Design an enzyme around this catalytic site. Structure first.
Site, PDB file in Angstrom:
ATOM      1  N   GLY A   1      36.870  34.904  30.270  1.00 56.41           N
ATOM      2  CA  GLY A   1      36.807  35.074  28.800  1.00 56.41           C
ATOM      3  C   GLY A   1      37.902  33.981  28.072  1.00 56.41           C
ATOM      4  O   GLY A   1      38.164  33.220  28.729  1.00 56.41           O
ATOM      5  N   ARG A   2      37.817  34.065  26.937  1.00 59.06           N
ATOM      6  CA  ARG A   2      38.915  33.070  26.043  1.00 59.06           C
ATOM      7  C   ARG A   2      40.372  33.372  26.345  1.00 59.06           C
ATOM      8  O   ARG A   2      41.285  32.786  26.478  1.00 59.06           O
ATOM      9  CB  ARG A   2      38.591  33.082  24.634  1.00 59.06           C
TER      10      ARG A   2
ATOM     11  N   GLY B   1      41.240  34.251  29.297  1.00 58.95           N
ATOM     12  CA  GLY B   1      41.593  33.748  30.495  1.00 58.95           C
ATOM     13  C   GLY B   1      40.711  34.554  31.592  1.00 58.95           C
ATOM     14  O   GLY B   1      39.321  34.537  31.180  1.00 58.95           O
TER      15      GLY B   1
ATOM     16  N   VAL C   1      40.361  37.862  34.759  1.00 57.43           N
ATOM     17  CA  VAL C   1      40.758  39.085  35.656  1.00 57.43           C
ATOM     18  C   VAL C   1      40.187  39.072  36.982  1.00 57.43           C
ATOM     19  O   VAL C   1      39.111  38.738  37.129  1.00 57.43           O
ATOM     20  CB  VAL C   1      40.816  40.471  35.052  1.00 57.43           C
TER      21      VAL C   1
ATOM     22  N   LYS D   1      45.328  39.452  35.687  1.00 58.36           N
ATOM     23  CA  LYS D   1      45.014  38.933  34.812  1.00 58.36           C
ATOM     24  C   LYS D   1      45.966  37.480  34.741  1.00 58.36           C
ATOM     25  O   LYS D   1      47.064  37.523  34.531  1.00 58.36           O
ATOM     26  CB  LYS D   1      45.327  39.588  33.377  1.00 58.36           C
TER      27      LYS D   1
ATOM     28  N   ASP E   1      44.465  46.820  19.333  1.00 59.26           N
ATOM     29  CA  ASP E   1      43.189  46.483  19.859  1.00 59.26           C
ATOM     30  C   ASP E   1      42.345  47.296  20.565  1.00 59.26           C
ATOM     31  O   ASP E   1      41.724  47.097  21.532  1.00 59.26           O
ATOM     32  CB  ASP E   1      43.233  44.880  20.574  1.00 59.26           C
TER      33      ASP E   1
HETATM   34  C1  LIG Z   1      41.121  45.344  29.640  1.00 61.15           C
HETATM   35  O1  LIG Z   1      42.047  44.774  30.333  1.00 61.15           O
HETATM   36  C2  LIG Z   1      42.613  44.554  31.595  1.00 61.15           C
HETATM   37  C3  LIG Z   1      41.750  45.041  32.456  1.00 61.15           C
HETATM   38  C4  LIG Z   1      42.108  45.077  33.943  1.00 61.15           C
HETATM   39  C5  LIG Z   1      41.140  45.697  35.097  1.00 61.15           C
HETATM   40  C6  LIG Z   1      41.830  46.499  35.824  1.00 61.15           C
HETATM   41  N1  LIG Z   1      40.875  47.057  36.603  1.00 61.15           N
HETATM   42  C7  LIG Z   1      39.707  47.009  36.847  1.00 61.15           C
HETATM   43  C8  LIG Z   1      38.907  45.953  36.213  1.00 61.15           C
HETATM   44  C9  LIG Z   1      37.543  45.763  36.302  1.00 61.15           C
HETATM   45  C10 LIG Z   1      37.040  45.694  37.835  1.00 61.15           C
HETATM   46  C11 LIG Z   1      35.676  45.569  37.944  1.00 61.15           C
HETATM   47  C12 LIG Z   1      34.800  45.281  36.809  1.00 61.15           C
HETATM   48  C13 LIG Z   1      33.420  45.022  37.086  1.00 61.15           C
HETATM   49  C14 LIG Z   1      33.126  43.715  37.793  1.00 61.15           C
HETATM   50  C15 LIG Z   1      32.920  44.171  39.258  1.00 61.15           C
HETATM   51  N2  LIG Z   1      31.616  44.975  39.483  1.00 61.15           N
HETATM   52  C16 LIG Z   1      30.486  44.085  40.165  1.00 61.15           C
HETATM   53  C17 LIG Z   1      31.371  45.747  38.307  1.00 61.15           C
HETATM   54  C18 LIG Z   1      32.816  46.378  37.717  1.00 61.15           C
HETATM   55  C19 LIG Z   1      35.234  45.356  35.539  1.00 61.15           C
HETATM   56  C20 LIG Z   1      36.530  45.497  35.229  1.00 61.15           C
HETATM   57  C21 LIG Z   1      39.619  45.225  35.127  1.00 61.15           C
HETATM   58  C22 LIG Z   1      39.260  44.290  34.151  1.00 61.15           C
HETATM   59  C23 LIG Z   1      43.199  44.443  34.286  1.00 61.15           C
HETATM   60  C24 LIG Z   1      44.048  43.923  33.150  1.00 61.15           C
HETATM   61  O2  LIG Z   1      45.049  43.059  33.602  1.00 61.15           O
HETATM   62  C25 LIG Z   1      45.436  42.911  34.842  1.00 61.15           C
HETATM   63  C26 LIG Z   1      43.637  43.992  31.887  1.00 61.15           C
HETATM   64  O3  LIG Z   1      44.425  43.300  30.961  1.00 61.15           O
HETATM   65  C27 LIG Z   1      45.639  44.060  30.574  1.00 61.15           C
END
Ligand SMILES: COc1cc(-c2cncc(-c3ccc(C4CCN(C)CC4)cc3)c2C)cc(OC)c1OC
Ligand SMILES: COc1cc(-c2cncc(-c3ccc(C4CCN(C)CC4)cc3)c2C)cc(OC)c1OC
Ligand SMILES: COc1cc(-c2cncc(-c3ccc(C4CCN(C)CC4)cc3)c2C)cc(OC)c1OC
Length: 283
Positions: free
Chosen positions: A16-17, A19, A21, A34, A133
């Site tokens: 995203g904007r 950065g 994850v 992140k 947020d």
């Molecule tokens: C909102 O914010 C933050 C979130 C996270 C975070 C922690 N666990 C898992 C996720 C994740 C994993 C997998 C998917 C999808 C893609 C893979 N698959 C094909 C389907 C599933 C989506 C999301 C995330 C994004 C970490 C952050 O910081 C390190 C964040 O910022 C504070």
């Protein structure tokens, strides 16, 4: 002693904007990394400053592991490392999952629980914290059916919020900016919208609504500030409650709850603790 710091980045799960994850690996274990854009460095600083003040630990708050700043030739690299939730965000999950009564209540009570933990000052403890947020993309789904709240880059202790989820007093710029309770009440508005997003996906009498974001029917994608202000402030619209909810006692009770998060008067809105108590008495 040896300090093994290397994290192996394995797959990008978000870009995203802000950065990116990544799913990463440290000592055999999944972590989430992140990597901040230069544009959003202040979010890394704010979250880091908050965790340097109070090491939040709660089952419904995304678990902190580390904040890393690394010197590069002509830039600074900023990483936030947290627990990894393989099921991904609530936003993701709701697209192609429907819920039963038990799973819907478990989700929303876990969110209320994490939010009340942020909001409450504990003496002896933690400062009170407003998120600023809250939305379904900033909530992760755990394998045990509870959720956790993520992203404290805008949080305030006692970038602007996502416009679709902004309370009326943010949109009409009447918010009492020096008054901490104001920020709690902004989170409660956004919580009510999340509660509506989830409730739509709860089946009753063989019926379910498709996933939609709040105000999908009255604003464009990437709605402007003005678009939101006209809907929420001028016309005083609120998300639709489908008739089918009124056949189901759980969705009838959840509709009442979400109404009491959406009052124009911020001080009329329910507190996160009162929302928790109400949810424990449903079913
Ligand atoms: C909102 O914010 C933050 C979130 C996270 C975070 C922690 N666990 C898992 C996720 C994740 C994993 C997998 C998917 C999808 C893609 C893979 N698959 C094909 C389907 C599933 C989506 C999301 C995330 C994004 C970490 C952050 O910081 C390190 C964040 O910022 C504070
Ligand atoms: C610097 O950077 C990173 C470090 C680590 C990491 C790796 N091994 C061991 C450690 C460790 C923890 C704690 C102690 C304590 C022992 C008790 N004593 C009384 C005080 C000190 C010692 C060592 C750490 C912190 C991981 C990282 O990533 C996950 C790091 O990068 C962010
Ligand atoms: C950052 O994150 C992780 C860190 C570690 C880790 C590695 N070396 C040493 C430690 C440690 C040892 C001992 C103390 C002391 C503190 C003083 N007190 C009186 C007794 C206990 C503290 C810290 C840890 C915690 C492991 C992790 O996972 C297994 C981490 O998670 C990814």
């Amino acid at each position: 002693r040896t300090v093994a710091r290397d994290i192996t980045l394995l797959e990008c799960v978000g870009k995203g904007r802000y950065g990116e994850v990544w799913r990463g690996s440290w000592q055999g274990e999944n972590v989430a990394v992140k990597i901040f854009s230069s544009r959003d460095e202040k979010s890394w600083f704010r979250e880091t400053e908050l965790y340097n003040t109070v090491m939040l630990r709660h089952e419904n708050i995304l678990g902190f592991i580390a904040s890393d700043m690394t010197s590069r030739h002509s830039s600074t690299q900023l990483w936030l490392i947290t627990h990894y939730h393989e099921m991904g965000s609530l936003y993701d999950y709701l697209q192609l999952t429907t819920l039963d009564t038990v799973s819907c209540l478990r989700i929303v009570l876990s969110i209320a629980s994490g939010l009340a933990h942020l909001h409450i000052e504990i003496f002896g403890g933690k400062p009170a914290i407003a998120h600023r947020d809250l939305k379904s993309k900033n909530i992760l789904v755990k394998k045990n059916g509870q959720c956790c709240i993520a992203d404290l880059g805008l949080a305030v202790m006692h970038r602007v919020g996502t416009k679709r989820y902004m309370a009326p007093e943010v949109l009409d710029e009447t918010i009492q900016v020096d008054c901490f309770d104001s920020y709690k009440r902004v989170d409660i508005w956004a919580f009510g919208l999340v509660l509506w997003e989830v409730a739509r996906r709860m089946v009753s009498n063989g019926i379910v609504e498709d996933y939609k974001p709040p105000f999908y029917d009255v604003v464009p994608n990437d709605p402007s500030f003005e678009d939101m202000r006209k809907v929420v402030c001028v016309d005083q619209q609120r998300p639709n409650i489908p008739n089918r909810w009124f056949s189901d006692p759980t969705l009838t009770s959840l509709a009442k709850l979400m109404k009491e998060c959406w009052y124009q008067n911020p001080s009329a809105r329910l507190t996160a603790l009162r929302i928790k108590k109400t949810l424990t008495k449903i079913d």
